[PDB]
Amino acid sequence: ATPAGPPPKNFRLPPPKNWDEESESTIDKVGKYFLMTEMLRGMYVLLEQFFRPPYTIYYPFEKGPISPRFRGEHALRRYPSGEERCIACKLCEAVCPAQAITIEAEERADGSRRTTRYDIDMTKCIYCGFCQESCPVDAIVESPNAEYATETREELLYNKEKLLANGDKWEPELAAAIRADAPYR
Amino acid sequence: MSYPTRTLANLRKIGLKEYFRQLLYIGDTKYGELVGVDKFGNKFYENKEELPLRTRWVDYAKHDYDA
Amino acid sequence: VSFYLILIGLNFVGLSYLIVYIGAVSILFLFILMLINIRTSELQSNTSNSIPLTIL
Amino acid sequence: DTGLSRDQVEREFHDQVIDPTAKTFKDLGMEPTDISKWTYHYLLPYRPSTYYDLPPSTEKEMREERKYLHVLDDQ
Amino acid sequence: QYALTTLDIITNWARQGSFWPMTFGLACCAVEMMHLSTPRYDQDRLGIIFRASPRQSDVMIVAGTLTNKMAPALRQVYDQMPDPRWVISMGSCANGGGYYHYSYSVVRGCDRIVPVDVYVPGCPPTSEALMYGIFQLQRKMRNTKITRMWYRK
Amino acid sequence: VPWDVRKSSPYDAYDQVEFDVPVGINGDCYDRYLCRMEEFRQSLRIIHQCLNKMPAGPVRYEDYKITPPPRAAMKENMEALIHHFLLFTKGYAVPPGDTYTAIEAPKGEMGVYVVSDGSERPYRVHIRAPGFAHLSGFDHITRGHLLADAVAVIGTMDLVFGEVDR
Amino acid sequence: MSYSQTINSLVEVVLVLVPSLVGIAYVTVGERKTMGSMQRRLGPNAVGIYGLLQAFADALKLLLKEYVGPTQANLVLFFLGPVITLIFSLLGYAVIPYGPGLAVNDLSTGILYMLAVSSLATYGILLAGWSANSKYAFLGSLRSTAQLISYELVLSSSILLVIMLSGSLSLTVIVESQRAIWYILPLLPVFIIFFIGSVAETNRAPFDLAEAESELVSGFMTEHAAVIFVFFFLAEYGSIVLMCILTSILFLGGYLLINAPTVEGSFYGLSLGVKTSILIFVFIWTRASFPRIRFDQLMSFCWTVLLPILFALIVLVPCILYSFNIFPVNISLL
Amino acid sequence: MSAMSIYIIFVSIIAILFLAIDLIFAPHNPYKSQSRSPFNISFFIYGLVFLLLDLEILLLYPFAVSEYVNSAYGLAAALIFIGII
Amino acid sequence: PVPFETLIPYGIIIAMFGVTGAGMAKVRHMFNGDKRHRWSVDQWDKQQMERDRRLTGHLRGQTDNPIAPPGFEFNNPWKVXXXXX
Numbered sequence A: 001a002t003p004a005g006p007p008p009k010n011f012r013l014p015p016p017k018n019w020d021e022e023s024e025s026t027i028d029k030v031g032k033y034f035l036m037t038e039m040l041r042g043m044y045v046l047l048e049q050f051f052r053p054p055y056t057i058y059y060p061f062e063k064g065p066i067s068p069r070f071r072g073e074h075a076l077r078r079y080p081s082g083e084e085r086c087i088a089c090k091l092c093e094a095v096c097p098a099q100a101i102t103i104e105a106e107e108r109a110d111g112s113r114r115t116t117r118y119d120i121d122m123t124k125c126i127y128c129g130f131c132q133e134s135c136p137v138d139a140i141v142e143s144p145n146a147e148y149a150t151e152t153r154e155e156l157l158y159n160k161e162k163l164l165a166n167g168d169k170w171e172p173e174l175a176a177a178i179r180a181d182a183p184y185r
Numbered sequence B: 001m002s003y004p005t006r007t008l009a010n011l012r013k014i015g016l017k018e019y020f021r022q023l024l025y026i027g028d029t030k031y032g033e034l035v036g037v038d039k040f041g042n043k044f045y046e047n048k049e050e051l052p053l054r055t056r057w058v059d060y061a062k063h064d065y066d067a
Numbered sequence C: 001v002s003f004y005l006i007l008i009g010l011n012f013v014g015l016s017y018l019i020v021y022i023g024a025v026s027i028l029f030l031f032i033l034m035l036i037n038i039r040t041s042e043l044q045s046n047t048s049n050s051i052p053l054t055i056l
Numbered sequence D: 001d002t003g004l005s006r007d008q009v010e011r012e013f014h015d016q017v018i019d020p021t022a023k024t025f026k027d028l029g030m031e032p033t034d035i036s037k038w039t040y041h042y043l044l045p046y047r048p049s050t051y052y053d054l055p056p057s058t059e060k061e062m063r064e065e066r067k068y069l070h071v072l073d074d075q
Numbered sequence E: 001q002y003a004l005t006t007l008d009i010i011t012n013w014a015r016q017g018s019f020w021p022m023t024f025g026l027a028c029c030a031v032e033m034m035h036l037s038t039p040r041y042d043q044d045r046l047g048i049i050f051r052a053s054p055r056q057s058d059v060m061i062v063a064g065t066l067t068n069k070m071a072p073a074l075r076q077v078y079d080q081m082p083d084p085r086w087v088i089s090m091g092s093c094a095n096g097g098g099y100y101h102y103s104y105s106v107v108r109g110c111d112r113i114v115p116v117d118v119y120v121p122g123c124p125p126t127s128e129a130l131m132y133g134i135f136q137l138q139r140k141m142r143n144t145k146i147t148r149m150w151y152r153k
Numbered sequence F: 001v002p003w004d005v006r007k008s009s010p011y012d013a014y015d016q017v018e019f020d021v022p023v024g025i026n027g028d029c030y031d032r033y034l035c036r037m038e039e040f041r042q043s044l045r046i047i048h049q050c051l052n053k054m055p056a057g058p059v060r061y062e063d064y065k066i067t068p069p070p071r072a073a074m075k076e077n078m079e080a081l082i083h084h085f086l087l088f089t090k091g092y093a094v095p096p097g098d099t100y101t102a103i104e105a106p107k108g109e110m111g112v113y114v115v116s117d118g119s120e121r122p123y124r125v126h127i128r129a130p131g132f133a134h135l136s137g138f139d140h141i142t143r144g145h146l147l148a149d150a151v152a153v154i155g156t157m158d159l160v161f162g163e164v165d166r
Numbered sequence G: 001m002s003y004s005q006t007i008n009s010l011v012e013v014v015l016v017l018v019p020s021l022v023g024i025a026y027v028t029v030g031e032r033k034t035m036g037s038m039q040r041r042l043g044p045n046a047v048g049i050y051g052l053l054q055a056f057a058d059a060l061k062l063l064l065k066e067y068v069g070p071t072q073a074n075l076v077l078f079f080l081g082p083v084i085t086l087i088f089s090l091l092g093y094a095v096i097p098y099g100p101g102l103a104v105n106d107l108s109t110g111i112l113y114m115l116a117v118s119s120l121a122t123y124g125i126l127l128a129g130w131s132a133n134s135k136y137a138f139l140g141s142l143r144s145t146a147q148l149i150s151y152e153l154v155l156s157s158s159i160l161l162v163i164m165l166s167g168s169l170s171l172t173v174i175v176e177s178q179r180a181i182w183y184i185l186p187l188l189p190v191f192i193i194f195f196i197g198s199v200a201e202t203n204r205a206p207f208d209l210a211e212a213e214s215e216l217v218s219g220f221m222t223e224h225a226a227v228i229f230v231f232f233f234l235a236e237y238g239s240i241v242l243m244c245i246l247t248s249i250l251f252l253g254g255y256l257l258i259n260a261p262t263v264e265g266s267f268y269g270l271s272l273g274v275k276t277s278i279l280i281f282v283f284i285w286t287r288a289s290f291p292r293i294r295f296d297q298l299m300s301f302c303w304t305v306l307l308p309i310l311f312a313l314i315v316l317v318p319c320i321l322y323s324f325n326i327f328p329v330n331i332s333l334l
Numbered sequence H: 001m002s003a004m005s006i007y008i009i010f011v012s013i014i015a016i017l018f019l020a021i022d023l024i025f026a027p028h029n030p031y032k033s034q035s036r037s038p039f040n041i042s043f044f045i046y047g048l049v050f051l052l053l054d055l056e057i058l059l060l061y062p063f064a065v066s067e068y069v070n071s072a073y074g075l076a077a078a079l080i081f082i083g084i085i
Numbered sequence I: 001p002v003p004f005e006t007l008i009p010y011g012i013i014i015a016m017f018g019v020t021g022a023g024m025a026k027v028r029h030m031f032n033g034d035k036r037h038r039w040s041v042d043q044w045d046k047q048q049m050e051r052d053r054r055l056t057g058h059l060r061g062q063t064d065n066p067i068a069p070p071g072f073e074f075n076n077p078w079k080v081x082x083x084x085x
C-alpha cells in the first residue's frame, strides 16, 4: 500500500476523537441539526442561479458553434473548371476504418482516370475524416452539414450522383473550411 | 428567458404585431440588425449584446420552418 | 355506514369511522393479506351444504 | 369492426360446404393441423398465473412449508 | 371534412407538444442524447420529457450499438409500448451496424429487429442533429391523417 | 492507498507538472466522492500549468515513415507523396514484440496489451478496462448490505459498459 | 333567499372546482419553469405562447394514448384504485374558505373532513400496486402506503396543536382566529414540521421513492400509462395545491390580508392565492435542491424525530394555554 | 340541492369523462407457478403503530374543541392520558 | 435578471384564487338579497333566521317594528320529517 522505504511522515492518522473532545459548541451543534443550516444554504444557491441568465439557445432559430474542422455529411468536389477532383486512387477506400467506401474505376471516354462507382454507406461511416485526410486532391471532404436525417435507411446509401450533388451545393462552405484549416493540414 | 427590461425594450423597437409573430415561432422577443437574406428567403440578424451563441439568428421564410 | 351516520347528523363519529376503520384498521388488514401466500382454492367451502343451516 | 353486422348475422346461419372439384392442400404437398393443437400455444398468455389461482397444496407441499420461516422478524 | 381535419390538427398538436421518448441509451450516442436535456438545448422547453419505462413513452430512440445478446430485450420493450408509437434509429451502429458491422456479436441495424420511423446519421450525431430528427418525426406526426384516414375508408 | 499511475510511472508531460493526489481513509462512497471533487481542482491546476508551459514546435513525430507528411509537402516533393501513399494504404510497420502499457485514466488504471508481429496490423490488442475489474467486485462490496445502497455503489464505480464489454 | 338553491350550488361548485383545475394545470407548468430557471434553462416555452399550453398537450396526449392493463385480472379493480385516488384528492377543496364562510361546505367539523378524505385516498395507491399483479411494483406501492400513513400521523398531530389555539375545527374560525396573529409565529416549529409532513404526504422529493426510477426497487408510479397516469398525476398535483392551501389556512392566516362585495372577495381570494403560490414555489424549490432520502431513513425521521417532538409539543402547548388563561371558547364565535 | 352533493357528483363526472375518452378514442389491441418469499415484519409494525397512535390522536381531538369547559381538571386527565400513551 | 416567463404560471394560479373568491362572494351576496352572507351559523343563528322569514318572508329580512303583523302568532314553522328522530 505505501511505497517501500520508511512510512510517509504523518501517514498514520491520530486516534479518533470522542464526543467529549469535539471542538464545537452544543448550541451550534443543536442549531444546525434542528434548523438544517447547510440545506438552507444549498437552497439559497438555487435562488442565486434563478436570477442568473440561462444558457439555453432557441434551436433551430439559433445554432451552436462548429469549427472549420467539423466532420459532417460527405461531398465530392470539383476543380474551378468543373472537372471532378477524384482520380480513383482508392486511398480513401483503403484507409476507411469501417469499410464504408466502395469504388470502381476505368478510363473515361477521353482517357482520364475517373470513377464509375463512388458509394459511401452512411450507416457504416464513423465520421472520422480519414478519407479527407488521405485524399491527395481534396476530392472527398466532410461538409459541416449535420441536418440530413432520413425517413428510410436506403436514403443513406450515397452513390456518386448524390455525393457530387452534395459537393455542388456545399462548395462555398467546403472551400471556406479548407481555406481556414489547410495551413494546419 | 427574457427579463422585463429586455422584452419591454424589444417590444418598443419592433411593435406588438411583430412581437406576437415572433412569439409564434421563436418564442422570444428578439431584435437586431438585418445581416442579409438567403436564396430561400430566410432573414439573418445579428446583435452582439445578446447572450453567447444567441448573437446570430434566422427568421425562416416558411411557416413550416426546417433547419 | 359512515355515510349513513353523517347524513343523520352524527358527523364526528361518522368521520371517525372513515379515519379509524378505513383509514388505519383496513389498511393494516390489506397489508397483511396482500403479503401472505393465499391459494383461493384452499379457502372455498361448499356453501350449498351450509344453506339449510343458514336459513334456520 | 364490431365483429357484428347484418350480413354477418346472416353468415352465421350458413354452414361451410366444401367444393369437391377444387384443389386442396394435398395438391400443394401440405397437411393442415387441427385447431385443438394450437389453442394452448396461442392462448397460453391469457391463462391467469397469479399465486391466488394455484390448486390446493399437496400433503407433500404442506409438510415442506414447515422447513421455512415465512416472515422476516429481524426486518 | 373540415371538422375531421380540426380533430386531426388537435390530436397531432398534442402528439407533437408532449413528445416523450424512452431512451434506450445503449452506448456513446446516449451521451449526445443526454446533452439534449441539458441547459444549452433544453428539450423540456419544447415539451420533450425522457421516460424510463416503455409504458409511459411514445417514441423509442435506439441510441447505441445493438448486440445480439441485447436484441431480445429491445424487442421486448418495443412490444410494451402503447400505440401510437414511433422508433428513431440514432447513430451509424443503430442504423446499419456502424464500426462493428463486420462483428460476430452485432446486429447490422436495429431495423432487423424493430420498424424504424426516422434514421439520424452521424457517429455520434450532434445534439442538434438528434433534434433535427425529432423535428422530422414531429413533422411526420403533423402530417399524419387520423380522422380523415378513417373517413376515406 | 496513495497510488496514481501519473506519479508512479509518469507519461507525456505529467512529470513536468505539479498536482496533488486525493486519498480517502474510510474506503466508502463518501470518501470516493470527495476524492473526485478534489480531482476537479487538481485537473484545473494542471491545465493552467500546461497553458503556460506549452512549447513551440511540431505536434507530430518528424519521420514521415510513421506520421503522415503535411499536405503541402505531400503535393510538393516525391518523397513526401510516397510516404503519404504508403501510410494510408499499407500503414507503418511496427517492430515485433509486445508491451503492457498503463495510464491513469479518469476511471482508474487503463491498460492495453499489444502484440506486434512486425507487420502493419497488430497481432493482438487486449484492453484492460478499470470498469471491468470494478464491476467484478460488485458482489464482494455489496453482499450482506441493503438493496437500497446498490445504486450508490454502482455510481461510485465509474461504469461505462463500452469499457466493460469492449 | 333570492334565486334558486340549485342554481347557487351549481355556480358555487363551478367557481371553486373549475378554477382549481386550471391552477393545478399551471402548477405543473410552473414546476417545469421554476426548476428550469434554477437549472439555468427555460422550461416549457413552445407549447402555446410562453409554454402556457404545455399541460393541456400532456393531458390530451395521455388521454388518447392506449392503455395496457394487467393480464385480465379485473377491469373494475384495475381502474378502482385510480378513480378513488382522484375523487378523494379533489373532495378536500369543498371545505376551503375563500373568505369568511366562502366555501362549498362551511363545515364545523371541516378539519376532520380533510383528514378523512386524505385517508381514503391512500387506498387507491395500495389497491393499484396489488392490481398490477407484479410483486416488484407491489412492494414499492406498499412502501409508499407506509410512508403516507406514517406522515398522516405527523399532519394530524400538528393540526391538533392548531385546534388547541383556535378551539374549533371550522376552517373559517381557524382563519378568523389569526387576525390576532398568524399561527406561524406562536407555532413556528409546528409549521416547519407540518410543511415537511405535507411534502412526504404527497410523495414529493426528497420523499419521492414512489416515482424514482434510478433507485433499483423504487418507481411504483413509473408503471402507469395513458388514463391511469392522468388519474394519479392529477391527484398528486391536486393534493400538492391542497396541502399548500391548508398550510396557509393553518399557519399563514388563510385569506387574511397583510367596501364593494366583488373587490373584498377578490382581495381575500388573492391573498389566499399569493400565500398558496409561495408555498407551491417552496414545494418546487425543495425538489430541485435536495437528493433523495432512503426508505429506511425517511421512516426513522418520522418516528424518531418528528413524532417525539410533536408529542412533546402536545404536552407543552395546553399547559401554556392554561397557565396564561388563554384556553379559547369553543362556542360559535368568529 | 346542496353544494356538497353537486360537488361530489361533478368530481365523479370528471373521473368518468377521463375514463370515457381513453376507452372510446384511444386505440385498443389484444396486447395482453409464481415464486414466494417471506415478508418483512417492519410493514406490520408501521401499520400497527400508526393505527394505535392514530386512535390516541383521535381521542384527543374532543379535548381541543372543549378546552374552555375542561379547564384545569380536564387538562389533568388529558395529561394523564398523554403520559400513559 | 428576472425570468418573468417562469413567474407567469404563478400569476395564473394567484388569479384563479381571486376569481373563486370574487365569484363566490358575489353569487352568495345576490342569494342573500344584496347583503353580505352569514358564517359560523349555529342553532341560535338558524332559529333567528327562520324567525326573520316568518316576519318578512325572506330568511335575511329585517324589520325594526315593535308590533308583529297579524298572523305572526300563527306562522311559527313546526318542521315534519318521516324517519330520522
Ligand code: SF4
Binding pocket: A085, A086, A087, A088, A089, A090, A091, A092, A093, A103, A131, A134, A135, A136, A137, A138, A139, A140
Ligand atoms: S476521393 Fe480522393 S482518395 Fe478517394 S479515390 Fe477519389 S482521389 Fe482517391
Ligand code: SF4
Binding pocket: A092, A095, A096, A097, A098, A099, A100, A101, A120, A124, A125, A126, A127, A128, A129, A130, A131, A132
Ligand atoms: S469518415 Fe471515416 S468511416 Fe466515414 S467514409 Fe471517411 S474514412 Fe470511412
Ligand code: SF4
Binding pocket: A126, E027, E028, E029, E030, E063, E064, E065, E090, E091, E092, E093, E094, E098, E099, E122, E123, E124, E125
Ligand atoms: S454510432 Fe458511433 S457514437 Fe453512436 S453508439 Fe455507435 S460508436 Fe458510439
